[PDB]
Amino acid sequence: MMKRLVYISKISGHLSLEEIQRIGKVSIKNNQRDNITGVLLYLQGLFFQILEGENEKVDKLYKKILVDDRHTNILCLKTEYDITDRMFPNWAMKTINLNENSELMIQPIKSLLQTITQSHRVLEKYMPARVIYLINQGINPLTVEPQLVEKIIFFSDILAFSTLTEKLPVNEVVILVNRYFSICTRIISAYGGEVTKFIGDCVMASFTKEQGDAAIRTSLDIISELKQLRHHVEATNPLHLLYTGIGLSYGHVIEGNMGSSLKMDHTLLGDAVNVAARLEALTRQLPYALAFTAGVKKCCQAQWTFINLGAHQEAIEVYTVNEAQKYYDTLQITQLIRQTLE
Amino acid sequence: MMKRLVYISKISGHLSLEEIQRIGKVSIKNNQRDNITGVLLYLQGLFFQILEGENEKVDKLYKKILVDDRHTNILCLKTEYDITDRMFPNWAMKTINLNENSELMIQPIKSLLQTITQSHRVLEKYMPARVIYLINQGINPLTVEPQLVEKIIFFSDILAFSTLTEKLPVNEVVILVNRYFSICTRIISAYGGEVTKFIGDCVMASFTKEQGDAAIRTSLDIISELKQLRHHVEATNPLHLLYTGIGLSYGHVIEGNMGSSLKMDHTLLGDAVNVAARLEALTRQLPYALAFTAGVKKCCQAQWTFINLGAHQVEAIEVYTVNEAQKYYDTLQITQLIRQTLE
Ligand SMILES: Cc1cc2nc3c(=O)[nH]c(=O)nc-3n(C[C@H](O)[C@H](O)[C@H](O)COP(=O)(O)O)c2cc1C
Ligand SMILES: Cc1cc2nc3c(=O)[nH]c(=O)nc-3n(C[C@H](O)[C@H](O)[C@H](O)COP(=O)(O)O)c2cc1C
Ligand SMILES: [Cl-]
Ligand SMILES: [Cl-]
Ligand SMILES: [Cl-]
Known part of the structure; x- marks a missing residue:
């Protein structure tokens, strides 16, 4: 049984490209060992990561990612259970720097992702702690x-x-x-x-x-x-x-x-x-x-x-x-x- | 003096792809007439649009878009005043169907855009009506x-x-x-x-x-x-x-x-x-x-x-x-x- 989680986080301080690269390396080796796949995006001081694999291997990894020094204000946005197909089966951990993408056809989706995510982090502050808890646990609060x-x-x-x-x-x-x-x-x-x-x-x-x-x-x-x-x-x-x-x-x-x-x-x-x-x-x-x-x-x-x-x-x-x-x-x-x- | 807005909305039901094409068609004629540029994007029942141009001409268009019956639950996420450069100076109104993009390298950004936007719309339901008003008016609620x-x-x-x-x-x-x-x-x-x-x-x-x-x-x-x-x-x-x-x-x-x-x-x-x-x-x-x-x-x-x-x-x-x-x-x-x- 496999699960998929998606979270966003705030980049702690200023991380240079080589430390971000250091994350990509150790992630690729560990995720290959645990048969974990996913993608890591970062844009304007924010991290975006999707993780998929066996429930134990993924939840073991997420507890370690939570206590990582290099990011803060971690919010798990979505947790898909009983998934049949991996979304990125050939990427142990694909790291993409969206800041360095200057392609014109990608600027609209890149601009929207930055605007909606920054707006999302603002709305999070106004939520009751119970609502943030339910979202973090992969539960839609509207249907509880x-x-x-x-x-x-x-x-x-x-x-x-x-x-x-x-x-x-x-x-x-x-x-x-x-x-x-x-x-x-x-x-x-x-x-x-x-x-x-x-x-x-x-x-x-x-x-x-x-x-x-x-x-x-x-x-x-x-x-x-x-x-x-x-x-x-x-x-x-x-x-x-x-x-x-x-x-x-x-x-x-x-x-x-x-x-x-x-x-x-x-x-x-x-x-x-x-x-x-x-x-x-x-x-x-x-x-x-x-x-x-x-x-x-x-x-x-x-x-x-x-x-x-x-x-x-x-x-x-x-x-x-x-x-x-x-x-x-x-x-x-x-x-x-x-x-x-x- | 130019401004730039960006909003999301819920696509009203029964909206065919043919009706969307006339939206982009009419938008190209009017936005080029008014020197308005931007991009219209839709993905999994949601509209995404960025509009930029002169202040009064952009406002005039947005009030008309607000009463358009082809979408509901409109939230203007961000307003940039006195912009120096247009973000899409060559596009009167480019319509992008993100549902049809199946290229593998775009899929991560596309999947994240849907996840964060759907999560965003859930948070909006718990927001105070006054804060939603401030965001729609281009006011930063954390600094006002x-x-x-x-x-x-x-x-x-x-x-x-x-x-x-x-x-x-x-x-x-x-x-x-x-x-x-x-x-x-x-x-x-x-x-x-x-x-x-x-x-x-x-x-x-x-x-x-x-x-x-x-x-x-x-x-x-x-x-x-x-x-x-x-x-x-x-x-x-x-x-x-x-x-x-x-x-x-x-x-x-x-x-x-x-x-x-x-x-x-x-x-x-x-x-x-x-x-x-x-x-x-x-x-x-x-x-x-x-x-x-x-x-x-x-x-x-x-x-x-x-x-x-x-x-x-008392x-x-x-x-x-x-x-x-x-x-x-x-x-x-x-x-x-x-x-x-x-x-
Ligand atoms: C944003 C972010 C994403 C990360 N993703 C992974 C990952 O997918 N796989 C992984 O093994 N480590 C990942 N890490 C690093 C882990 O938190 C941890 O530091 C690393 O696994 C070191 O393993 P160890 O200290 O137990 O030996 C990530 C770190 C950050 C800041
Ligand atoms: C999501 C959405 C975006 C739209 N964007 C534009 C636009 O950028 N420019 C434009 O002229 N009309 C746009 N329209 C259509 C207008 O709201 C309106 O229907 C159209 O301009 C007709 O103008 P008129 O009937 O007042 O002459 C949009 C409609 C929708 C539903
Ligand atoms: Cl006591
Ligand atoms: Cl107020
Ligand atoms: Cl009386």
């Missing part, structure tokens, strides 16, 4: 049926954001929100979470039921990095006033494509979505920057010092960890933010 | 600066949706929410509004300050169509229990693309977003399915019977509605009925 899954829902936004938008210039708000989004997205993804969307100044993400401790560590790391950043910059920098509240929930959610032909989107339906956003807002009245449900506590194996914060509106038990304790008074900080921006 | 704009914010969601998710199978709630999203998105777009995103069962949209009456008409039309739907279906259909509440606000919001190279999104930054979401939730406690601020009321010029619902803490703000938004039902009675029907 929605499923009831057990998810930890993550919500985090900016403290006193109404005051920040009221007093700061728009360009200064954008710099602050982009930095907040960058910190949250990097940490969530580092712990295996999946960012769903940005809603105003709010970051929505999900974790699996096996990632309870990772969800808590994500929340504490975001709080820790914001605390570091606030004393990194000067008092005239709006980042000096950046705080966050975080809420976590756990429950059954329907994940999949929702909408119509006018607008379809990756959506999460469930009570846990509403609950996580409510606990996120509840942190404003709590001496803790993180609040989560009993279900999230049940998903944790680490020895957290869980703190019961009573029942809140049916009514749900609210928990936190001792590490999430605020070294400040929330009301005084909101006053300090407004006073600083006066 | 967000702007402070005056917007009416729209928020609506499903009444007792927790009970619906608790008591219905997965395929049934998906059908129900898809029908709700379809009704809302069609009506919002029909009145000129822009659906921002779906947040669970909640629909977020925006209107301009000149669309105050359109936002109220959108809200009443959604409520009206759900009322029609409930008596169109049988009692065993979950759509028989579909109700909505709607909140509207007005204020300054920062609109633009936010995030990092790892994750981007289109968002609206402002107090008005939170206020509209709070007023939407307030409709559960009100005898009206629509609630909005005084700012929305000031954006209206039609002869609505505005009703003051008093001050409400400092408290005045909450308003229109007499048409009155509920013919008791809200708590309906939520208990939804729970008891699904028992």
Whole structure:
């Protein structure tokens, strides 16, 4: 049984022709050994490669290509299973430099390939992490049926954001929100979470039921990095006033494509979505920057010092960890933010 | 001063090769008359075209191509302004059938072009409508600066949706929410509004300050169509229990693309977003399915019977509605009925 995969990647730094040639050599010898065939194209700092052969031999090779130093931002676009015929049966690995092709009849298809691929890499950034995951696994996300899954829902936004938008210039708000989004997205993804969307100044993400401790560590790391950043910059920098509240929930959610032909989107339906956003807002009245449900506590194996914060509106038990304790008074900080921006 | 555009589109069904030849035939006569050059390519049901020439002459042609019924789902991928040299100065319009090219050395580039373009069209389905607009207008969404704009914010969601998710199978709630999203998105777009995103069962949209009456008409039309739907279906259909509440606000919001190279999104930054979401939730406690601020009321010029619902803490703000938004039902009675029907 043979499979065929196609991926694109970003060329790491500047690779000269001899190192690219070095890839072609070692590829030809190894692919001949593993009976693997394919084509490698590169154009304007992007790699294009098609691989075909036995499933084990191809998947063994792709794991090694993933950890290669010479390219980054790897996305597998298509995986064809149970293929009957090779597409390039006489090319162990044919390397083609599309940059050096100056033939006039090939310029249209070469120009289109560059334009659509560069546009493709832009659209990838706006996708939910779940959509990129399905494409990477060779699954068309448009034909996946929605499923009831057990998810930890993550919500985090900016403290006193109404005051920040009221007093700061728009360009200064954008710099602050982009930095907040960058910190949250990097940490969530580092712990295996999946960012769903940005809603105003709010970051929505999900974790699996096996990632309870990772969800808590994500929340504490975001709080820790914001605390570091606030004393990194000067008092005239709006980042000096950046705080966050975080809420976590756990429950059954329907994940999949929702909408119509006018607008379809990756959506999460469930009570846990509403609950996580409510606990996120509840942190404003709590001496803790993180609040989560009993279900999230049940998903944790680490020895957290869980703190019961009573029942809140049916009514749900609210928990936190001792590490999430605020070294400040929330009301005084909101006053300090407004006073600083006066 | 010349510009160059490139777009992709879906070939409309039943389009014969003979019809394509007359496209290229007519294109050659008009583009040479207008000093327009470019290439038209098609592969596996998709059109690819590059157009270059003087700004107004290229624009005039593209508006005519936009309304051509021989293709749909047109996306202008890239626009280059003030180009120095034409890319195809000798081709008024060269038509290339990539389906007929079987040369072995072109096959890799041809196979990759189809794979990336088909993958691209899948990603477009998940893109925010505002970003698709920016790309069509030749604007780089990753570098364009967000702007402070005056917007009416729209928020609506499903009444007792927790009970619906608790008591219905997965395929049934998906059908129900898809029908709700379809009704809302069609009506919002029909009145000129822009659906921002779906947040669970909640629909977020925006209107301009000149669309105050359109936002109220959108809200009443959604409520009206759900009322029609409930008596169109049988009692065993979950759509028989579909109700909505709607909140509207007005204020300054920062609109633009936010995030990092790892994750981007289109968002609206402002107090008005939170206020509209709070007023939407307030409709559960009100005898009206629509609630909005005084700012929305000031954006209206039609002869609505505005009703003051008093001050409400979301400092408290005045909450308003229109007499048409009155509920013919008791809200708590309906939520208990939804729970008891699904028992
Ligand atoms: C874009 C790209 C494509 C590659 N394709 C192949 C390939 O098709 N076959 C192969 O053996 N190595 C390929 N490599 C190199 C492998 O990642 C790896 O470095 C090589 O197989 C060295 O094998 P070894 O370190 O296990 O001895 C590719 C590397 C890059 C950057
Ligand atoms: C994919 C596609 C590309 C087209 N490209 C051109 C073109 O480059 N130049 C042109 O004159 N017409 C082009 N047309 C046809 C025009 O849209 C239009 O049908 C034609 O110019 C008729 O002009 P008129 O009826 O307004 O006189 C294209 C049509 C399609 C479907
Ligand atoms: Cl702890
Ligand atoms: Cl925008
Ligand atoms: Cl009225």
